[PDB]
Design an enzyme around this catalytic site. Sequence first.
Site, PDB file in Angstrom:
ATOM      1  N   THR B   1       0.833  -1.191   0.000  1.00 17.25           N
ATOM      2  CA  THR B   1       0.000   0.000   0.000  1.00 17.25           C
ATOM      3  C   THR B   1       0.863   1.236   0.000  1.00 17.25           C
ATOM      4  OG1 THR B   1      -1.794  -1.097   1.184  1.00 17.25           O
ATOM      5  CG2 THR B   1      -1.763   1.303   1.196  1.00 17.25           C
ATOM      6  N   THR B   2       0.682   2.081  -1.004  1.00 17.87           N
ATOM      7  CA  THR B   2       1.422   3.326  -1.105  1.00 17.87           C
ATOM      8  C   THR B   2       0.493   4.396  -1.644  1.00 17.87           C
ATOM      9  OG1 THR B   2       3.455   2.112  -1.537  1.00 17.87           O
ATOM     10  CG2 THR B   2       3.433   4.443  -2.019  1.00 17.87           C
TER      11      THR B   2
END
Lengths: 152, 191, 240, 240, 232, 238
Positions: B1-2
């Site tokens: 997740t970014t």
Amino acid sequence: MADGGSERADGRIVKMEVDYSATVDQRLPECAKLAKEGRLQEVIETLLSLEKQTRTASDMVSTSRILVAVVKMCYEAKEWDLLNENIMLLSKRRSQLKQAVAKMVQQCCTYVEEITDLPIKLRLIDTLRMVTEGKIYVEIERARLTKTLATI
Amino acid sequence: TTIMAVQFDGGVVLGADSRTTTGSYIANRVTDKLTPIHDRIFCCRSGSAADTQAVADAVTYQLGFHSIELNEPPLVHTAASLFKEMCYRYREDLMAGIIIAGWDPQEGGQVYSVPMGGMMVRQSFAIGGSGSSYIYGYVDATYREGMTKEECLQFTANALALAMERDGSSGGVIRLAAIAESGVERQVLLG
Amino acid sequence: SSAGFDRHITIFSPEGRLYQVEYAFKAINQGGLTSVAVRGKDCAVIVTQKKVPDKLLDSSTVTHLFKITENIGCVMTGMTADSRSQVQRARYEAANWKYKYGYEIPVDMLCKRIADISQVYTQNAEMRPLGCCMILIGIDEEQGPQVYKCDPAGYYCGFKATAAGVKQTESTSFLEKKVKKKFDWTFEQTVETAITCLSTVLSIDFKPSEIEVGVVTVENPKFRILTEAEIDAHLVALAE
Amino acid sequence: TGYDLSASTFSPDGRVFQVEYAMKAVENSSTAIGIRCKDGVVFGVEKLVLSKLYEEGSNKRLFNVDRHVGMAVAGLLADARSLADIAREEASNFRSNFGYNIPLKHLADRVAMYVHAYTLYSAVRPFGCSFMLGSYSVNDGAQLYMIDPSGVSYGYWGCAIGKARQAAKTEIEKLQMKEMTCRDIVKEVAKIIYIVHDEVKDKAFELELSWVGELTNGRHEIVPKDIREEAEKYAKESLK
Amino acid sequence: ERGYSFSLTTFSPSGKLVQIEYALAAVAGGAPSVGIKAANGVVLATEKKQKSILYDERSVHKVEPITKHIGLVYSGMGPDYRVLVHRARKLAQQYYLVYQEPIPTAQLVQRVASVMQEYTQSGGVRPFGVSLLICGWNEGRPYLFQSDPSGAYFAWKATAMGKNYVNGKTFLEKRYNEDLELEDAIHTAILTLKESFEGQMTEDNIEVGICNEAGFRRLTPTEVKDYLAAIA
Amino acid sequence: NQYDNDVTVWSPQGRIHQIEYAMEAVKQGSATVGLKSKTHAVLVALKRAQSELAAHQKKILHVDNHIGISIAGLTADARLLCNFMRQECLDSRFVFDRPLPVSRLVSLIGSKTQIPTQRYGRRPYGVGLLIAGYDDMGPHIFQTCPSANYFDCRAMSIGARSQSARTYLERHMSEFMECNLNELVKHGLRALRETLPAEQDLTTKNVSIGIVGKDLEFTIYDDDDVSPFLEGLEERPQ
């Protein structure tokens, strides 16, 4: 401000024969706007009634010869143009119409003892097509009453 | 997740990956990490999944009622306050990292950061998520003040592509969104 | 006659009636205002005049045309303090439909939620029954436009063209003569009848400064309050 | 009679006398006006001194609710200090949840609902107060609001509360509103207080003026009163 | 509220209850209705008018379903009717969550009348102004019950309520027999509703719902237009 | 007459009569006078006894080290507001560690008495106060009423026949700034003696004095230390 309307009416009645009649139609939408607004003291319903009495006098003196159907066309083209600019009421109830109707039937009754039956029954059949679906209300009705008494 | 958010002279530019993991298994290849709260205000959520979906609905509920009553388009700082009040009150029960970014008529484009403690801070650019630790050096040497819109689209595209390559929890596909005074331009890239 | 306290609280009469609720129906008429709703084939018009007694008073904070949701507008008659309390309830329960259910509330379902609350105020005897009316418009998917009317007794029904306020029995009598002759209804046909009904009943022939128009359209489902310029545009257009 | 004891009952023709009674309670109180110029709002309260009866500066009716919001209460003074606590408390929770300053359109609405809530039940009575809300903001201009004991609240340019209600707004509308600096308006307020209420009933009266706008940077405060004192010097120039 | 909770219905010195008798007066001056139970199904027929040509008939419904096989009409007043409909809707769900089985029609009426009675003894409120007709075809045999503002249930073969109900009562007393079919029951139900009606009897002036053993079914106006050909 | 029973009911004249009846209960009490100076806030009260052998009923009662009040109504509502009053001073003492200003104390009182004057079933507090405090902006004299209106006065009197005491303080209001304690006090007890009949006076048995000042904690004197004050007086003329 009606000093301008007074001097334009003073400009017309001298210059009906010298100036051409289309300038009256070029002075027609100006008096149409002067009749539209309505102010307190500068222009008033009586001064609007007198300026229409003078042009209808100038339009009947111009159409006092055998060529009558200009005043009948230009007024009907005036009354149709004044309906499409304004909303529902034209501007008022009496002055722009009932004096001028009583003017024309006064002009008709004076002219009928000299003029032939043709342009006056053209005049009568034009105003009967006016007062059958235009101004059919009360205030006033004697201008219609002597109309059909002269028509008969 | 970014997650990723960069402001510029007009509005802002958002961006995130799409990969949802359950620890070593991909439960979802493609995920809308970002969420329309209002017509000019998005967020992009990180941390838990059940928690951040729960908060983003309630903020959309409260901001929606508040703006109809006030009969104006709301403020981005107003929406950033509402995430702060819930995440600080339930900081013992929520693992949520939110970046709020949106265009506002009063103050142009704004980017806020609400990390897991429940604080709030305006930034020019803001990153977050589990893969965001790998692009700190890149985002500091590449960011330059006064970019256009297309430079920011190219900027966030390279920034997300590096973290997806290097982190295992991040990957999938890239979702972008440019919020401005005119509209919202959403697009999906690869590369 | 009067038995017990049937003139005072909401209980029954020996004639099988009650009196407080039918006092509330003519608690609207102290407002001194009349509003007309007309539904066409692809639109729904709300028209309502306003009275401005003071020059030292704004022309913005007056109009009863309110916006419940982005696709639902309304108009309020009766007194004003009870009206805005009614509107905040309608704004509040429209949003809860979104949070609970997910999709946009129909305009029909909202009138049930309002009329249930007005029922309870009639029902428990220790509170006031809120005398003000309610008219809604809105576009439904695969159902077209709708027009409803909540009442302080607590009932509602759909309509085709129905006014409220002070003058109904002249306004509804004119709308029946307009509808049953089976004419066309497009957009400007619907707007012109909503003016001329309120024009002929009130017998005013006004300047475009008092009335407000709140039409919604199939092509544009957003609730929209018309500009004073384009209100003047329709009025001179129907004028011959 | 018989119907005018509770706030829950209606009249046989459909009004509520307890609200009607509280309205004329405010009418039997001293005069307070409020007017906005193009960059601010000026408050003015005629304040009566009987012989000595207190200090110079007791029980002022120019309350200060928010940092940018004023009050001009008139009526029953004890209930006015209650609303000032309610309106203060309302603006604080707006600051806590949100975190920009309270808009004046909400603060009129949020208070007037609490006024309206006391006009329903037989437990409580209506408030006997009426007041003005004045603000200024560089994003919104100045706004001026006005609440009655019923709860009907909306916008004005110039209003007046007290015995001199119709007699004071007769000459407020004689002025201009857009072509005025508020510093010019300050001495224009003071003549109207000096014009109305001849000292036949009450010899001594004070004049408290408060002033929020562009020059005070949105912060609401009292005028510099003992400083420069140009109001009363200009006000008593109207002896003929 | 405050804590008053005092019952505003007490006994007369004669020994009767006053407000319930007045609530029955509101029911008798309501819209007429009829219901007939005929050995294979039960037919409900109400009578719906409109004061104008401006109302809509696809909006307010009188015949209202409850579960999948239980219908319900009324004859009293309007807003109070919708209250105990929504009450009975939820009341049939706690049966179905617990017992996992559709509620019997006798079991609803014990529960609805218990709601309605307990409502009158408690303080601060008036009784309802609605009488009901509940039906359903459960376990082979169909059923037809009637409640009232007092909260008492009955079990009719064929009754009527609303205006002129005694005239409809004597009419069914000669019209109804031991048994008919369902269609004959519809034909006599329109016949007794045409007793006290007005001249226009269209597909919109009446509104009819049946209960098959196949289930509840509400009739669309197309068949009611088609069935009213040579009615009564 | 039917609308003169409840607090909630308004009037067709516009005036709630239950408040107006509570004003008359204050007039049934004895008289007391409060005044101030630049540095002191002396209030002087007048005791009454029930019989010849019973003790006189006390008027001045201590609240804090810089605030003391007098009393003019019922005695239940006296101690009910007093126990509220003691409670509020020590809470600010416990929290902020500072004495309350007198001005913001009294707004708590006017808020406190408001609620039983609007809800049904409650009576108003039939009592009037004279609060004399001292804080960072000087001495203060505050009078109250059951109508929840508090007044920043410089000298007032409430109770029975307090009008003749007010007329004394009007024609001597200028002198009250430049007076220290002795002529500050013996101004004040000249105001009470105009509220008396012409056959009895202050006997050091029916008089109390409460002084609070700059370097002076609020102190109540009665029956022994009034005799140093009751000197340098005169009889009333005829």
